[PDB]
Each structure stands twice: as structure tokens, then as C-alpha cells.
From Swiss-Prot:
Role of this protein: Ceramide synthase that catalyzes the transfer of the acyl chain from acyl-CoA to a sphingoid base, with high selectivity toward palmitoyl-CoA (hexadecanoyl-CoA; C16:0-CoA). Can use other acyl donors, but with less efficiency. N-acylates sphinganine and sphingosine bases to form dihydroceramides and ceramides in de novo synthesis and salvage pathways, respectively. Ceramides generated by CERS6 play a role in inflammatory response. Acts as a regulator of metabolism and hepatic lipid accumulation.
Source organism superkingdom: Eukaryota
Phenotype of null mutants: Mice show behavioral abnormalities including a clasping abnormality of their hind limbs and a habituation deficit. Knockout mice are protected against high fat diet-induced obesity and glucose intolerance. Mice show decreased palmitoyl (C16:0) ceramide pools and increased energy expenditure. Conditional deletion in brown adipose tissue or liver also protects mice against high fat diet-induced obesity, while it is not the case with specific deletion in myeloid cells.
Tissue expression per record: Broadly expressed, with highest levels in kidney and brain (at protein level).
Location within or outside the cell: Endoplasmic reticulum membrane
Name this protein carries in UniProt: Ceramide synthase 6
Portion of the parent chain present: 76 to 126 of 384
Region (Homeobox-like): 8-58
Induction context: Up-regulated in liver in response to high-fat diet.
Length: 64
């Protein structure tokens, strides 16, 4: 619950929503919608996602 500055139409704040509130791996159809809010290219968006997951480490220990 980031409490500081209003950010509902933010470029990231939103991306973080469709990431968990919808799915960590959004499809083209989805990205298309973000293109507006984010104001980027359907391809520019993915870049944010692909990286998002990468940065976010998986849950649970790494055995094996």
C-alpha cells in the first residue's frame, strides 16, 4: 500500500495491477489496452513485463 503520491493512471502502478490483478503473463489483447494508459507501443509494454518477472524472484527454496 504505497502511501505517498496519488498514482492511479501511472505507467507502472497500472502495469503492476494487470500483472497480479489479472495475470503475470498478459496476452497481446491485454497489452493493447495498456498501450493507452501507458501511452506506449504494444511492444514497449511487454519490455516492462518481461523485465518485471525477471526482477521478481520466484517463491520457495531452490532445491535440485
Amino acid at each position: 500500500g504505497s502511501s505517498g503520491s496519488s498514482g492511479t493512471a501511472q505507467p507502472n502502478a497500472i502495469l503492476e495491477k494487470v500483472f497480479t490483478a489479472i495475470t503475470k503473463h498478459p496476452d497481446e489483447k491485454r497489452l493493447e489496452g495498456l498501450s493507452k494508459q501507458l501511452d506506449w507501443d504494444v511492444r514497449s509494454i511487454q519490455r516492462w513485463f518481461r523485465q518485471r518477472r525477471n526482477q521478481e524472484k520466484p517463491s520457495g527454496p531452490s532445491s535440485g
